[PDB]
Amino acid sequence: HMAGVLTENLVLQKTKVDSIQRVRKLNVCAAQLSDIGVLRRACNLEVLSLSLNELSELGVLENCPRLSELYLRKNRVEDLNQVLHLSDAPNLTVLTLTENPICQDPNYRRFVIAAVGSLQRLDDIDILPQEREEAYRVFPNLHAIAPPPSLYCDPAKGKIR
């Protein structure tokens, strides 16, 4: 019944710390994961690798203000608006979403850049100053857009709702 659910036990076995709040780096690639709600308390997580899982819903990551690098290659993210859960991540400089369905949506790269103001690199390609400027011209308001509802975060503050 916990098939696909990341558990506290598995995280703490792997990382050797006493609480989810003390997890700073976590690599759980290729673990058949579809539920990562346990990360709601991962307030100190900085480097997170979740590639090659079954994830479609990113709301738990609103609880991770320290996130610096986030690897999500080859998941099941189907809705571009899931990336709005990363809009308020002030320290997130590296993101990979390659091989999720959204990567083939028109204007995916511009949307992600315009949504995540801190980002310096997306999908293994650094974001140039002029690339960011152009993304904001196309999509000027994404930091104000409410992210989708989630079981695993409260509604983000400072959004049009």
Author numbering: 0 to 160
Paper text:
Cilia and flagella associated protein 410 (CFAP410) is a protein localized at the basal body of cilia/flagella and plays essential roles in ciliogenesis. Our work revealed that CFAP410 is a bimodular protein comprising two highly conserved domains, including a leucine rich repeat (LRR) motif at its N-terminus and an oligomeric helical bundle at its C-terminus. CFAP410 was shown to localize to the basal body and interacts with NEK1 and SPATA7 during ciliogenesis and DNA damage repair. Homo sapiens CFAP410 (HsCFAP410, accession code: NP_004919) is 256 amino acids long and a number of single residue mutations, including I35F, C61Y, R73P, Y107C, Y107H, V111M and L224P, have been associated with skeletal and/or retinal disorders.
Here we report a 1.0-Å resolution crystal structure of the N-terminal domain (NTD) of Trypanosoma brucei CFAP410. In the end we obtained crystals only for the construct spanning residues 1–160, which is what NTD refers to in all subsequent structural analyses of TbCFAP410. Residues 1–138 fold into a canonical leucine-rich repeat (LRR), with five tandem repeats forming a calzone-like structure. The LRR motif contains five parallelly arranged β strands forming a flat sheet on one side and an array of four short α helices on the other. The space between the α helices and the β strands constitutes the hydrophobic core of the LRR motif and is packed with many highly conserved leucine residues. Additionally, we found that residues 139–160 of TbCFAP410 forms a long hairpin-like loop, which is tightly packed on top of the helical surface of the LRR motif. The loop makes extensive contacts with the LRR motif via six hydrogen bonds and numerous hydrophobic interactions. All TbCFAP410 truncations with the intact loop were soluble, whereas those lacking parts or the whole loop, i.e., constructs covering residues 1–149 and 1–140, were all insoluble upon expression in E. coli. This further suggests that the loop is essential to facilitate the folding and/or to stablize the structure of the LRR motif in TbCFAP410. In the crystal structure of TbCFAP410-NTD there is an extensive surface patch across all five strands of the β sheet. Location of individual residues corresponding to the five disease-causing mutations in HsCFAP410 can be clearly visualized in TbCFAP410. These residues can be grouped into three categories, including one surface residue that is fully exposed to solvent (R75), two semi-exposed residues (V37 and Y107), and two hidden residues that are completely buried in the hydrophobic core of the structure (C63 and V111).
